From a paper:
The hPar-4 binding residues in hSPSB1 are completely conserved in hSPSB2 and yet the binding of hSPSB2 to hPar-4 is weak (Kd = 1.5 μM). Perhaps as a result, we were able to crystallize hSPSB2 in complex with the higher-affinity [name] peptide but not the hPar-4 peptide. The most significant difference in the hSPSB2/[name] structure is the complete lack of electron density for the C-terminal residues of the peptide: only residues Asp184-Asn190 are defined, compared to Asp184-Phe201 in the equivalent hSPSB1 structure. Overlay of the two structures reveals a likely clash between [name] Glu196 and hSPSB2 residues Glu55 and Gln116. The N-terminal region of the peptide is otherwise bound through identical interactions, with conservation of all interface positions. The amino acid substitutions from Gln116-His119 do induce a subtle conformational change in β7 and loop D. For example, the φ angle of hSPSB1 Gly128 changes from + 72° to − 164° for the equivalent hSPSB2 residue His119. However, changes to the neighboring hSPSB2 Tyr120 are minimal, with the lengths and angles of its hydrogen bonds to [name] Asp184 and Asn188 being essentially unchanged. Comparison of the apo-mSPSB2 structure (PDB ID: 3EK914) and the hSPSB2/[name] complex reveals only modest loop rearrangements upon binding. An exception is the side-chain indole of hSPSB2 Trp207, which is significantly rotated upon peptide binding to pack against the side chain of [name] Asn187. In the structure of the hSPSB2/[name] complex, these changes also prevent interaction of the [name] C-terminal segment, and a main-chain hydrogen bond is lost from [name] Ala72 to the fourth Asn repeat residue Asn189.
Numbering used by the authors:
A (entry chain A): 20 to 219
B (entry chain B): 184 to 190
The structure:
Amino acid sequence: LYFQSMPEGLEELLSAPPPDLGAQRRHGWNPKDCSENIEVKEGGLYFERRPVAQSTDGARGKRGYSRGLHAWEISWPLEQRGTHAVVGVATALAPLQTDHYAALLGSNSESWGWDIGRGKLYHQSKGPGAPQYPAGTQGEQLEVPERLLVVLDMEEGTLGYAIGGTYLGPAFRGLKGRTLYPAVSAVWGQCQVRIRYLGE
Amino acid sequence: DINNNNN
């Protein structure tokens, strides 16, 4: 159970003075690596998805991580999530667009995400039946507030999340040897999704 | 539409 399982150094990372806006931009959304329907704003700190019907649209972070601890806060208003809002990571090979509404992040071998609307985990996931996260809720869905932390531990090869400062356990394992970028996939017209890189 | 998109 939960925080007993945090990556090494996570408390320290979070307690330190946060990266300045320069560091946040360098690790933020990549205008050169996002859906053609997404506009990156403030040099990486957030993106806005154009109101294009029958489209799911993703973005990757500018920086891919293969070693060490990496955590960033995602801020995504609850009224701007729509039918499919997924938060996680992707390799460089994961698709960033499809032409219908779907859980695009985690629907293939190149991406891993949490459906913050339904509480399910998607990796290589096509049909119904994806697992619930976090565990230990007796099957009860945990609602995800506006802000959540995404925590990638490339020393252990895990991805996990935190709400309200509380780490919810590893969601995915077996990530070592890969180069992984912050990622989301979104369907809501004019949604604004913010990324705040915290280290390391 | 359902996702605040213009059809």
